[PDB]
Amino acid sequence: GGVWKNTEDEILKAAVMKYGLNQWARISSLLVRKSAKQCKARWYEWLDPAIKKTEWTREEDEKLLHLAKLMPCQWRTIAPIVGRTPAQCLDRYERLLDQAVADDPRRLRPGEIDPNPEAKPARPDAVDMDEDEKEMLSEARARLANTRGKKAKRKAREKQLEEARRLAQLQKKRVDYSSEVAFELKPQAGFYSTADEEKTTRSMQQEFRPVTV
Amino acid sequence: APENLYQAHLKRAEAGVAAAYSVEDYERAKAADPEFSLKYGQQPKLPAANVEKMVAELQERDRKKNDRNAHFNKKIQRAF
């Protein structure tokens, strides 16, 4: 309900980068005011990068007028052939049509419901803020950053707890993968005698120099 | 490239023969040893230094030598 305030356009664009073009109810959740239908409409009618918001060419105007006589009032058909969007095509044709002739019953009334707020440009962020336009932005920032889960936090803490318990047990005192070699595959015999090599390995295992983790 | 690292393997071969061994070293080791065959398997008589040479040689080589999303794009600007 209401036109798009520029913070919403940018949260929608960041979400389209994070989430893609088919997650409009995931994107709809960052924005509290807007529903997935409106997010989708805003993207396709104003924020599609492939929308030419540039000034109108005049090859384009004569295409638009050719089409508006070929497929009369079929702006959804006409629009991709011009290359613009149906609201751009529609009001551009209205402009050109008044250019020929050179209140109005044909304009928005104060307190009426605008049909396509998703076609109008974004109301820019204002000199102030609101806990709506700041709590939404902070929700957006977090939800745009987070990809983790929670039990990793347990992880390190749990290991530390266990380490502390081990230390306490040591103070009180104050398979087996070290008795056996796990599923040991001994190197196969070759042409060279490895008796001496085996002795050296045992000596190396016997060594106990201080080493940090 | 296997040709690049092949001339680098020959780098290492000629460098290490220039670095660890000498012609009279070689020829007197031979003069002690008439068989330079059918002796395969039995370890040959060579100075105990030789071993660490290899080791030191290769160890020489050694001292010459979000988060995951950044890597992805960093492959694409690389490519695109």
Binding site: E10, P124, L137, L144, K159, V213 | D67
Partner: peptide, 30 residues
């Protein structure tokens, strides 16, 4: 006075440094 472009906020998110994990404490080991 400054507005809200994306990228800068993305950089801020990068600063929010995610949860890259803190290194295990180097407790002295006997």
């Amino acid at each position: 006075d400054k507005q809200i472009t994306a990228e800068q906020l993305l950089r801020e998110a990068k600063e929010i440094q995610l949860e890259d994990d803190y290194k295990a404490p180097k407790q002295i080991i006997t």
